[PDB]
Amino acid sequence: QKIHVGPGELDDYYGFWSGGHQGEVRVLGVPSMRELMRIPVFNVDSATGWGLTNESRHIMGDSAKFLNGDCHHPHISMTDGKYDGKYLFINDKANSRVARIRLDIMKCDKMITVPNVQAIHGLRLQKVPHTKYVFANAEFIIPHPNDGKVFDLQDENSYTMYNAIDAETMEMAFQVIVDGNLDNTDADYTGRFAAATCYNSEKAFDLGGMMRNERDWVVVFDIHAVEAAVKAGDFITLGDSKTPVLDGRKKDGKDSKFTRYVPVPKNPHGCNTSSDGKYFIAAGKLSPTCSMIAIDKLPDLFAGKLADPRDVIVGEPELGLGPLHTTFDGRGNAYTTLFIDSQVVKWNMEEAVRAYKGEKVNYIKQKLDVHYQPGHLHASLCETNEADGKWLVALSKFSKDRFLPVGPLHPENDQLIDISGDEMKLVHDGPTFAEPHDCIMARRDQIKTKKIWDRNDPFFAPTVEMAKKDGINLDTDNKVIRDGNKVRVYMTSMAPAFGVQEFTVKQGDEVTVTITNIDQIEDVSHGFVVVNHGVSMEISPQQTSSITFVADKPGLHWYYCSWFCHALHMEMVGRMMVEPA
Amino acid sequence: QKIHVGPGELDDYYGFWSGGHQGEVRVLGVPSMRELMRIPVFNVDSATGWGLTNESRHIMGDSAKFLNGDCHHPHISMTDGKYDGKYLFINDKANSRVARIRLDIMKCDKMITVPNVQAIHGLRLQKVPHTKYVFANAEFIIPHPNDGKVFDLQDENSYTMYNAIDAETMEMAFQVIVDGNLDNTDADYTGRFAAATCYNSEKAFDLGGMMRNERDWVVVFDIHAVEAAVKAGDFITLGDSKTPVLDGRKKDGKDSKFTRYVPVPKNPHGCNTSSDGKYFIAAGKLSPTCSMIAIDKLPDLFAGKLADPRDVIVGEPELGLGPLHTTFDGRGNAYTTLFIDSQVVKWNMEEAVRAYKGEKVNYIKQKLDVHYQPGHLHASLCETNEADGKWLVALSKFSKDRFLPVGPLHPENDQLIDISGDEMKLVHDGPTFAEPHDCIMARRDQIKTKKIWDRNDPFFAPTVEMAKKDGINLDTDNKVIRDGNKVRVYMTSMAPAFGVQEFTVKQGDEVTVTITNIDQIEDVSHGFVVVNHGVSMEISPQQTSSITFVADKPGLHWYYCSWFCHALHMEMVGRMMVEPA
Numbered sequence A, B: 001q002k003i004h005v006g007p008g009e010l011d012d013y014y015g016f017w018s019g020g021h022q023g024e025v026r027v028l029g030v031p032s033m034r035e036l037m038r039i040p041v042f043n044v045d046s047a048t049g050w051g052l053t054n055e056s057r058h059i060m061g062d063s064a065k066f067l068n069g070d071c072h073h074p075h076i077s078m079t080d081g082k083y084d085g086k087y088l089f090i091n092d093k094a095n096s097r098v099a100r101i102r103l104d105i106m107k108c109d110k111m112i113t114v115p116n117v118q119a120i121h122g123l124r125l126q127k128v129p130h131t132k133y134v135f136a137n138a139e140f141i142i143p144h145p146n147d148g149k150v151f152d153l154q155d156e157n158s159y160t161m162y163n164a165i166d167a168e169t170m171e172m173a174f175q176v177i178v179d180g181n182l183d184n185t186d187a188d189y190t191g192r193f194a195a196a197t198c199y200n201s202e203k204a205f206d207l208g209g210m211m212r213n214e215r216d217w218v219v220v221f222d223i224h225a226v227e228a229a230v231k232a233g234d235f236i237t238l239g240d241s242k243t244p245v246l247d248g249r250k251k252d253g254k255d256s257k258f259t260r261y262v263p264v265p266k267n268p269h270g271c272n273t274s275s276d277g278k279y280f281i282a283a284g285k286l287s288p289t290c291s292m293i294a295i296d297k298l299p300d301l302f303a304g305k306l307a308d309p310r311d312v313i314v315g316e317p318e319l320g321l322g323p324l325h326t327t328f329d330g331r332g333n334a335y336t337t338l339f340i341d342s343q344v345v346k347w348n349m350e351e352a353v354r355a356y357k358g359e360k361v362n363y364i365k366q367k368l369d370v371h372y373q374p375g376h377l378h379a380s381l382c383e384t385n386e387a388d389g390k391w392l393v394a395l396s397k398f399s400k401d402r403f404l405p406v407g408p409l410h411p412e413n414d415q416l417i418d419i420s421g422d423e424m425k426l427v428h429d430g431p432t433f434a435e436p437h438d439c440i441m442a443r444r445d446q447i448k449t450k451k452i453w454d455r456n457d458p459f460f461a462p463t464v465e466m467a468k469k470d471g472i473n474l475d476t477d478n479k480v481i482r483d484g485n486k487v488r489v490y491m492t493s494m495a496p497a498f499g500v501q502e503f504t505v506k507q508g509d510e511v512t513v514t515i516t517n518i519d520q521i522e523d524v525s526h527g528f529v530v531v532n533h534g535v536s537m538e539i540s541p542q543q544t545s546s547i548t549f550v551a552d553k554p555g556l557h558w559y560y561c562s563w564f565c566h567a568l569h570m571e572m573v574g575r576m577m578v579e580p581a
């Protein structure tokens, strides 16, 4: 199978990698494993001015004050259990956010901070009938209200919540209070059920305490029952949030009608739905197993028709040491990372189910050594009913000697594995920065990208609205609007000249520069940097970008195009002249 | 030759890429072209906390307020015209800086704002007898003083300057005023001479006016004469800067002792010393030529033995449309980018010289089409007398259709070219983010990196010193020091436990957390992230890092390790508890 993409040739799949602790999203070509684009999300990017521009800061809201993020889980919007290629969503663990990327422009266009929670970790998407909800985990137990009066985790009102976000609006839709905590999550192929893993059912703060129970659980959610309760107006609110809050804890040994708790050993981690829709598969982590829950049996569990919640367990196969995550080939095989054994294990799901019933059978097909200590793994289209069993990426945490020494900080090793055959063949070691935990692959024909910006694009629609209030037509105009010590420069840009090449202001004036790239040629980006003022942004073809800064320094100050756009690029410059105070 | 590095195999060269206007430095393996490591410099890195930690902000001094940078020209220190692998230096055009990276730890350790200039662009290093000076071009003409009294570029005191920095101390060494401006620069193989290109001899501000005269110049500096005058006290200063400033402007048609101006067509760009040390070669940009200055002849120019400045020009080969940069194979051939023709032209230098002298020889050997619009190119070891003629990287600005569509903003195309034989051949297309401009390659055996940190490392020595004062032994202690409204947490970390797992502070306190990674095994890095507090940092084996922030939010606040360090990493957490107002 394939492997080398020589000059002129194109990759077959897009990869969307999390940037990890660095905070961005990265687009790669598969199987070349080359990075094609960096998508700034929670990081501040000097190149594009994400985190610096008015458009980007507006999307971020108040969280624009944070220079950091921590992502793990990129996921693509679906329709009928199939990628529709409209949206990618990703978590921020550091500052408790969920972000949307529009796959047509390859930019983050929505960002929300989840209210009344701490640490958005696990995140996956509703599959069916489509991605109406972004389900997202809040990992850490906190007091409610968190005012510094109560610190106890055991306190009745100390808990965390499972979060649902409207995918289209990017507003909270509801929250569910749970016992224990939440790690990872996934969703069924009907839209009625979602599940999440929990490693801290003990509600402990110390290391030994979190490991005390032999089993924790995966909590199952009846999303339909939840929605009906929100609709009937049976919910509460907390503090300053309008978000409907539902109670999915167990009261006095009896289930809330929103949730079921299926005990699972031990500090489980991964929570993955098989591509046939049959199973939620929890990776056992401290237990050398996966637990297979049958979605088939879930209606009966919620209709109180099953004696023990363990009855929905249909398979609990032994796999090896340190199972973290599971993916699928769409041929009936599951593939699990074993962190401690440092392997990917390939196993037949339906044979494990047989084994659980006592049938004598070898469900393990193969173990492949990886280098080293795999966390997540991802097989192409695994999260869809179209899982194609072609490629597998295993993202390993310790690269040791697999790449040249680069000092005491090492890269992660994301290894491309051929899975189209009976035998898994390691094909490529891919060094990556700042620990992408997980990734997702899409067919090339599943992604449709704008070649150039449309002038009515929502991304800078507010900046367009500001321009009309000024009677400024962005497509044509090159003017300076003055309003107190506010200065609003509006300009066209065209390789190799700025539409406005000089302007004068007073020391202390607040300057906003709005640039519209009127070039029609694809790939002709411009940039705008103001020297010694910490101002930098990108303006791609047919885009409008704006940036606000203070001219605290008197004198002549140069602004230049940062993007090489033309033979006379070095000369694409202008002058801001600041009068003394 | 080569091309493919498979699993378990290692690259043959280190590549060091400028991150462009993204702001960082990137480490690659050649010939795989894979990104092994990112070294944050002018960017804020959320992963390692560069820009957030006290160690980094201290290195950045006052400029730590800037979140942006624009880097172009990475260069490795040399000893007797050969790489010595101690430091890499890089410019920042956007905020007028020069950074130093220690190649043993792959971190930026020193950073200077260059006084009284605007935009540090061109940069190269003294070659022989070693890298004593870092030379850097300030590109834009500004008034002196720059206080908003004069804006006219034609004024007696409106000018830019050439800069010399002591490579070891990272202090200013001297500055030389020049006419016109400064684009790129290189140095000879003796230490006496340096050269720079100028494209704005007209001192205009508009596009047409910068293209006014058919020639500008390269300006040659006599570093020995400059050093002679500085120690003979003969220098001026500008404002509050101690930096010795010398005048290299032409007076009334008469030269200064420090410079000579050699007319060159037209808006010349790249300035490159050949590997035999015979030529400063300037790429012609608007002239379809390059210009060859015989370094041989510079002593007679400066001594007044030569009739006219053009006498040091021993070659002006016609090469094609829009020459930008030149590199060398160490076989007598030069390789020049043609931005307009989109080609690398390979040519024989000695033959070009003989063709300027009259002889009719075809000095052009080959033209290779590149994709598309190349800027810089770099041949392996080209800046040393060991130029090995094996690899060539042409860094092109328009990727067009060469990679998968990823939206309106396109990657750059950095193309690996095999030049070890007689014919240049294109072997690999490497997509890169944010316009890397230039890059430098080094033999594997030229770089030596630390596997773990030394406890006594200068990088965090100030933090060690501060620890003494509080009475703290960093290798062992887990303490909290109260000092008014300032709390100073010291802790060791050892997978998978923080040394301090909870602390309590009062609303409003200034909390400094200092972490020392006492793990002994390589690659066992830890992280530190305070949830919803914009706090994030790396701590690698044997390192001490510190971050300061304001606990302004009452309640329970989780901190967690961001770097996957152990099987129980998810559980490597801690609590900050904040006592109400």
Ligand code: CUA
Residues within 6 Å of the ligand: A494, A495, A496, A497, A525, A526, A527, A561, A562, A563, A564, A565, A566, A569, A570, A572
């Ligand atoms: Cu616009 Cu370079």
Ligand code: CUA
Residues within 6 Å of the ligand: B495, B496, B497, B525, B526, B527, B561, B562, B563, B564, B565, B566, B569, B570, B572
């Ligand atoms: Cu320490 Cu993860």
Ligand SMILES: [Ca+2]
Residues within 6 Å of the ligand: A199, A200, A201, A202, A209, A210, A211, A212, A213, A215, A216, A266, A267
């Ligand atoms: Ca547990």
Ligand SMILES: [Ca+2]
Residues within 6 Å of the ligand: B199, B200, B201, B202, B210, B211, B212, B213, B215, B216, B266, B267
């Ligand atoms: Ca000129």
Ligand SMILES: [Cl-]
Residues within 6 Å of the ligand: A184, A185, A269, A270, A271, A272, A325
């Ligand atoms: Cl998962």
Ligand SMILES: [Cl-]
Residues within 6 Å of the ligand: B184, B185, B269, B270, B271, B272, B325
């Ligand atoms: Cl150059």
Ligand SMILES: [K+]
Residues within 6 Å of the ligand: A397, A398, A399, A410, A411, A412, B523, B524, B525, B564
């Ligand atoms: K690591």
Ligand SMILES: [K+]
Residues within 6 Å of the ligand: A523, B397, B398, B399, B410, B411, B412
């Ligand atoms: K480009």
